[PDB]
Amino acid sequence: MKEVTIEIKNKTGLHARPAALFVQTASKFSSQIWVEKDNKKVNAKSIMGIMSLGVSQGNVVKLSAEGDDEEEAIKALVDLIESKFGEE
């Protein structure tokens, strides 16, 4: 199991195009991957789950991954988030 705590800094939070990029990136890996916020936990590969979390700009989430490629999956999600999903 590999985890990281990280701030979502882009204008729309986990909504619109950033939400799609997040789920598409998570889906590239065999590991099971989770996202947590305020005692709520959802599947990172599920768009309905991500929407239900209601993540806005400045909010903080905890990412977790379990499987053969768990380290690589976390690295990819962190890199995408730290580029603000390709925005200023």
| 64 assigned to active site | no
- How was this structure determined? It was done by X-ray
Resolution in angstroms, to 1 decimal, for this deposition?
1.9
Q: Are 55 and 14 spatial neighbours (Cβ–Cβ below 8 Å)?
A: yes
Domains identified in the chain and CATH numbers:
1-88 (3.30.1340.10)
CA distances from 81 to 1, 68, 77 (A): 20, 22, 6
Q: What's the CA angle centered on 49, arms 47 and 54, to 5 degrees?
A: 100
Q: What's the CA angle centered on 48, arms 71 and 70, to 5 degrees?
A: 5
Of 9, 15, 37, 75, which residue is the catalytic one? 15
φ, ψ at 25 (rounded to 5°): -70, -45
